[PDB]
């Protein structure tokens, strides 16, 4: 399962602001091997950039531009890590 022992961060997974990058981490060295599914849905677009890490922690970051919450479905081996669905209320940038 893994989703039963995942520990994640989220400086920009609980709230973001257009023109500002947002990211999170899925620390789970315990679950060891076991990829993880992560995707977002909503009327907008963003630049995603992930990087595997022998630490099992999935480091990913993106910069959105159109305000609005983003349904982030985070599931391990297709399960549901603590609070899988994490919406992020996005706010305008500086314009």
């Amino acid at each position: 399962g893994g989703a039963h022992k995942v520990r994640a961060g989220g400086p920009g997974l609980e709230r973001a602001e257009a023109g500002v990058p947002a990211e999170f981490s899925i620390w789970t060295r315990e679950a060891g091997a076991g990829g993880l599914a992560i995707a977002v849905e909503g009327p907008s677009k963003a630049e995603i950039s992930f990087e595997d890490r022998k630490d099992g922690s999935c480091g990913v970051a993106y910069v959105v531009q159109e305000p609005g919450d983003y349904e982030v479905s985070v599931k391990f081996n297709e399960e549901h890590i603590p609070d899988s669905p994490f919406v992020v209320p996005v706010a305008s940038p500086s314009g």
């Binding site: 893994g2 899925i26 789970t28 679950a31 060891g32 091997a33 076991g34 990829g35 993880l36 599914a37 992560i38 995707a39 977002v40 849905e41 009327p43 677009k45 995603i48 992930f50 595997d52 022998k54 099992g56 999935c58 990913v60």
Partner: peptide, 21 residues
């Protein structure tokens, strides 16, 4: 509209099996 990316967790170095020998 709909996009994401798949990951692949994995350990760093290998490990000596049990001292079966």
């Amino acid at each position: 509209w709909k996009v994401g990316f798949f990951k692949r967790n994995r350990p760093p170095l290998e490990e000596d099996d049990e001292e079966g020998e």
